[PDB]
Amino acid sequence: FEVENLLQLLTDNVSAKGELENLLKEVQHLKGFLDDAAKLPSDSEQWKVLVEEIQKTVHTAEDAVDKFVVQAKLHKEKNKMARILDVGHLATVRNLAAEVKGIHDQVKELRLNNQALQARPTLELPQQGPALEDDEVVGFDEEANKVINRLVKESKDLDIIPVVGMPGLGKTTLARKIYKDPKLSYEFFGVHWVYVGQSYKIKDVFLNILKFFTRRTEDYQHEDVDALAKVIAGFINKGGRCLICLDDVWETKVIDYVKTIFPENEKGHRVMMTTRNKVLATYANSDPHDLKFLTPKESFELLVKRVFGKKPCPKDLVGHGESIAGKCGGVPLAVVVIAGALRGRPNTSDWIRVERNVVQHLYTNSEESCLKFVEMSYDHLPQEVQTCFLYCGVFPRGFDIPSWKVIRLWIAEGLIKPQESYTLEEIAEFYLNDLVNRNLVILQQKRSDGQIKTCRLHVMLHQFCKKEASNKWLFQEVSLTPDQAIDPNKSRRLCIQPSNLKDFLSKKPSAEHVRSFYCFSSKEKQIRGLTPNDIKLIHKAFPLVRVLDVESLKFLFSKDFNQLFHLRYIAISGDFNAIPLTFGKFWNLQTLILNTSTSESTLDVKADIWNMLQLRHLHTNIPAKLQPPTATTSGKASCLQTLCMVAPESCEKEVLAKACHLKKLSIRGQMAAFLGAYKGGINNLVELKCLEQLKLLNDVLYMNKAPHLPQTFSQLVRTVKKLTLTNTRFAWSEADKLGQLESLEILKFKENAFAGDSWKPKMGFSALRVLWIERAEFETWEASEINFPVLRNLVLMSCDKLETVPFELANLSDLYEMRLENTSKAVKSAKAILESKTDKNIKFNLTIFP
């Protein structure tokens, strides 16, 4: 046995690398086939079987390759004596080699046996409703009047009025309503309608337009595009003022084609167009008309209308009907589709069937129209954003998906690929920005800069993403009808709700193909009765985790968890006084979010963060006392872009030299002991090159002496875009020192950041965009035009002490935004400045709470 064992063991190691490379190349083949098959439309159960099988074989080979490389690195870590001497290593490594050969031959026979896989040169092989009347439209009366108003206002220029939203949001219904208002007839000689959609031809559109202006299109079918444009221009000139309806135009070229047909007769014509692309709407009109959201009562009224015509919904179905109405998120088409499923089912058994879940019920049966309706644009997304989109589907339904969390989740799953001059963080931020541009992913929260802060995936879109991923298996959500498991073995990843986590753990989960663990707290901070054994068994179940993201728990650094070298992105919480060195073995790691409940003032990062080349972002809820890099660790600049909640002690010349590419840096502690010359730890910030954000927080309320912004501070932080001061109690004279930042973009004064009865700024802020003052005790302000020449946003919250916003800021042309939150009499001056700007008729916004 041992003779034979060692014989085959030695024989195999001689092709382990060749077997590895051949398996990897053939798995690349199968992955290319898999992309092809995903693109293809399929209807044969055998084809779904084969796609399932190739996906599972591909992911099995991926696990084998990652295991082999991880073992190789582990061996290289061991000393030469423990390298040669180890015999268990020999057994495991050759068992791994044997598995790799088995899977390689499996891939060889997968390619050879199945004819479908053969390489092909270029071979992938790929109507409205009834029409409502005014009484059938719901809650659009105010919207219709607003849009018609916008249309009718006299303006010699050809102004556009676009309507934009999400798939099946009712836009075409708003246009059809608008299209049949007598007011529109009064204001315009001839209103004509046209539908474009994603697929169209201009000549079709131009011919249909011409039909309205003459019935002899048979004569002009021989005219060219520009001749037709001139003809229609003359026809309109004869007609007079005209409004043209455009249903679902998604391309700028189309708009720029439509401007042509309108003559320059200074009649102030109009074109109102529907577009699922917010950017297209924005170009069409500089101020869009985002289709409102139906309120739950309106949705219930619509469902009543549909599943019972005009006869009232019967009494007992009202409860269930109400339930169905609210759950649809406020988009009419979800109501429409579930009503379709409910047509003529006055028996409450089926109403209860449909209610119990009303997101799955769309995308089923023949009248699934929601699916294809959304797909009308998903295919309008490139593959990179296709995938980055689908991974918005992990977050629980109704969850608020943070911008940074989702950005690092994308970048931690390997979905994004590097570009030739950009950084993965900004490529991903652009991907999500664009995802909102296409209205694909709701965005209701705006950073001071105006960037995404919380994006949600609409209930209908949530179920669409979940089911689409499940079909592609990129991830999945575990469910349990009382008992059972829904085949999680067909789940490349598992998203588990905390409530069912204990039960899923009771079955002793154990998976290898799994490559992440998602368990978010939609009900924030509802940490259930999870024992340490639960966390240990979690560590056991998923050994190949790239993405271990769980924050509603008391996590611990079990030995098993310490072995997870494949780790990429960690979101854990508990009571940790210092990061153990075990984190120094997670070479694959790219991100680390830390939220510790420890009473310790500082967290000691024992793990050598410097050696982790793949590392990109470390986040801590409390200041981190990072060890400086040693001589051995000296090398290339670290990949670290974001380093949040840094202890000032851990800001040394060597650390900042090792993180010169650091972008987002936050430091909290004692400041005066950090601001002096011998406190040049601040002077050490010169090491940071691409630094952009800097949060300064003082943990002491009783300060020995008030610090002073060093004169070098102007250039010490020259690269910083965002700069938040918290509990700094700086003299407003120091605000002048803050006026010498060339690249200052955002400015937050939080918790008496600046101490003083009144603020009289002098230095101009040639680029500042957002001013943010929170809980400022200073009573009067005399900021002038020169101070903030390019003010675009000014936020002052909890200003119970401030007296009046200076009128001088009214002159600022750039300034359009002004929010006063829990502010004193200065609210009156906000009204005065708003009135002045309205008299000047400058686009400006004023928000007052409550």
Ligand X SMILES: Nc1ncnc2c1ncn2[C@@H]1O[C@H](COP(=O)(O)OP(=O)(O)OP(=O)(O)O)[C@@H](O)[C@H]1O
Binding site members for ATP:
136, 138, 168-173, 276, 306
Four-residue CA torsion sign, 470, 475, 480, 486:
positive
Among 332, 669, 707, 739, interactor with ligand X by CB under 6 A: 332
Among 37, 64, 144, 165, interactor with ligand X by CB under 6 A: 165
Four-residue CA torsion sign, 73, 75, 79, 80:
negative
* Interaction of residue 30 with ligand X, rule CB under 6 A: no
Query: Smallest gap, in angstroms, from Cβ of residue 368 to ligand X?
Result: 12
Sorted by sequence, the CB contacts under 8 Å of residue 700 that are 6+ apart come out as: 670
Q: Under rule CB under 8 A, which residues in 381-410 are in contact with a copy of itself?
A: 382
Residue 435 dihedral angles phi and psi, to the nearest 5°: -60, -35
Among 170, 329, 629, 648, interactor with ligand X by CB under 6 A: 170
Sorted by sequence, the CB contacts under 8 Å of residue 803 that are 6+ apart come out as: 779, 780, 781, 824, 825, 826, 829
Residue 788: closest CA among 810, 773, 766, 803: 766
* Interaction of residue 357 with a copy of itself, rule CB under 8 A: yes
Query: Smallest gap, in angstroms, from Cβ of residue 654 to a copy of itself?
Result: 19
Exposed e or buried b per residue across 395-425, where buried means at least 16 C-beta atoms within 10 angstroms of its C-beta: bbbebbbbbbbbbbbbbbbebbeeeeeebbb
* Interaction of residue 831 with a copy of itself, rule CB under 8 A: no
Distance CA 490, CA 577 (A): 39
Query: Smallest gap, in angstroms, from Cβ of residue 805 to a copy of itself?
Result: 23
Helix ranges (DSSP H) in 603-754: 653-658, 672-675, 713-716, 732-737
344: left (phi over 0), alpha (psi -120 to 50) or beta: left
DSSP 199: S
Which of a copy of itself, ligand X, none binds 780 (CB below 5-8 Å, type-dependent)?
none
- Say if residues 670 and 699 touch (Cβ distance below 8 Å): yes
Q: Segment near ligand X (CB under 6 A), from 81-89, 328-336, 426-434, 579-587?
A: 328-336
Work out the number of other CB atoms within 10 angstroms of the CB of residue 514.
Answer: 24
Q: Under rule CB under 8 A, which residues in 321-340 are in contact with a copy of itself?
A: 340
Sorted by sequence, the CB contacts under 8 Å of residue 220 that are 6+ apart come out as: 207, 210, 214, 228, 231
Work out the number of other CB atoms within 10 angstroms of the CB of residue 186.
Answer: 8
Sorted by sequence, the CB contacts under 8 Å of residue 721 that are 6+ apart come out as: 449, 692, 693, 743, 744, 745, 746
Q: Under rule CB under 8 A, which residues in 570-609 are in contact with a copy of itself?
A: none
- Say if residues 622 and 603 touch (Cβ distance below 8 Å): yes
Distance CA 48, CA 490 (A): 12
Query: Smallest gap, in angstroms, from Cβ of residue 336 to ligand X?
Result: 4
Nearer to ligand X, 180 or 606 (CB): 180
* Interaction of residue 265 with a copy of itself, rule CB under 8 A: no
Q: Segment near a copy of itself (CB under 8 A), from 327-335, 481-489, 590-598, 621-629?
A: 481-489
Q: Under rule CB under 6 A, which residues in 97-136 are in contact with ligand X?
A: 129, 132, 136
Nearer to a copy of itself, 478 or 651 (CB): 478
Query: Smallest gap, in angstroms, from Cβ of residue 232 to ligand X?
Result: 21
Q: What does the block give as tokens for 710?
A: 């060093």
Distance CA 102, CA 88 (A): 21
* Interaction of residue 483 with a copy of itself, rule CB under 8 A: yes
Residue 82 dihedral angles phi and psi, to the nearest 5°: -70, -20
Query: Smallest gap, in angstroms, from Cβ of residue 220 to a copy of itself?
Result: 13
Cα distances (Å, whole numbers) of residue 115 to 56, 190, 717: 18, 60, 62
Helix ranges (DSSP H) in 726-807: 732-737
Q: Under rule CB under 8 A, which residues in 227-256 are in contact with a copy of itself?
A: 229, 252-253, 256
Q: Under rule CB under 6 A, which residues in 230-249 are in contact with ligand X?
A: 248
Query: Smallest gap, in angstroms, from Cβ of residue 314 to ligand X?
Result: 20
Distance CA 628, CA 610 (A): 9
3-state secondary structure of 547: strand
* Interaction of residue 197 with a copy of itself, rule CB under 8 A: no
Q: Under rule CB under 8 A, which residues in 610-649 are in contact with a copy of itself?
A: 613, 636-637, 639
- Say if residues 536 and 560 touch (Cβ distance below 8 Å): yes
Cα distances (Å, whole numbers) of residue 182 to 57, 132, 188, 708: 64, 16, 10, 68
Query: Smallest gap, in angstroms, from Cβ of residue 372 to ligand X?
Result: 10
Among 120, 372, 446, 840, interactor with a copy of itself by CB under 8 A: 120
Q: Which amino acid is at 810?
A: A
* Interaction of residue 173 with ligand X, rule CB under 6 A: yes
Nearer to ligand X, 137 or 550 (CB): 137
Cis peptide before 498 (omega within 30 of 0): no
* Interaction of residue 288 with ligand X, rule CB under 6 A: no
* Interaction of residue 2 with a copy of itself, rule CB under 8 A: yes
Query: Smallest gap, in angstroms, from Cβ of residue 282 to a copy of itself?
Result: 4
Work out the number of other CB atoms within 10 angstroms of the CB of residue 17.
Answer: 12
Query: Smallest gap, in angstroms, from Cβ of residue 369 to ligand X?
Result: 7
# binding residues, a copy of itself (CB under 8 A):
117
Q: Which amino acid is at 132?
A: L
Q: Segment near a copy of itself (CB under 8 A), from 483-491, 520-528, 536-544, 648-656?
A: 483-491
Query: Smallest gap, in angstroms, from Cβ of residue 419 to ligand X?
Result: 26
Distance CA 814, CA 794 (A): 11
Query: Smallest gap, in angstroms, from Cβ of residue 335 to a copy of itself?
Result: 15
Q: Segment near ligand X (CB under 6 A), from 73-81, 169-177, 463-471, 551-559?
A: 169-177
* Interaction of residue 336 with ligand X, rule CB under 6 A: yes
Residue 758: closest CA among 726, 735, 728: 735
Which of ligand X, a copy of itself, none binds 257 (CB below 5-8 Å, type-dependent)?
a copy of itself
* Interaction of residue 512 with a copy of itself, rule CB under 8 A: no
Nearer to a copy of itself, 414 or 575 (CB): 414
Which of a copy of itself, ligand X, none binds 332 (CB below 5-8 Å, type-dependent)?
ligand X
Element (H, E) at 282: helix 278-284
Q: Under rule CB under 6 A, which residues in 366-395 are in contact with ligand X?
A: 373, 376
Nearer to a copy of itself, 613 or 700 (CB): 613
Q: Segment near ligand X (CB under 6 A), from 45-53, 162-170, 355-363, 727-735?
A: 162-170
Which of a copy of itself, ligand X, none binds 11 (CB below 5-8 Å, type-dependent)?
a copy of itself
Among 162, 168, 263, 498, interactor with ligand X by CB under 6 A: 168
What is the maximal distance between C-alpha atoms in the chain? 100
Which of ligand X, a copy of itself, none binds 169 (CB below 5-8 Å, type-dependent)?
ligand X
Nearer to ligand X, 275 or 787 (CB): 275
Which of ligand X, a copy of itself, none binds 343 (CB below 5-8 Å, type-dependent)?
a copy of itself
Query: Smallest gap, in angstroms, from Cβ of residue 45 to a copy of itself?
Result: 4
Distance CA 540, CA 732 (A): 56
* Interaction of residue 367 with a copy of itself, rule CB under 8 A: yes
Among 79, 142, 312, 349, interactor with a copy of itself by CB under 8 A: 349
Distance CA 439, CA 454 (A): 14
Element (H, E) at 793: strand 793-797
* Interaction of residue 403 with ligand X, rule CB under 6 A: no
Distance CA 285, CA 282 (A): 5
* Interaction of residue 199 with a copy of itself, rule CB under 8 A: no
* Interaction of residue 172 with ligand X, rule CB under 6 A: yes
Burial tier of 225 (Cβ tally within 10 Å: 0-12, 13-18, 19+): exposed
Chain positions contacting ligand X, by CB under 6 A: 129, 132, 136-140, 165, 167-173, 248, 274, 276, 302, 305, 332-333, 336, 373, 376
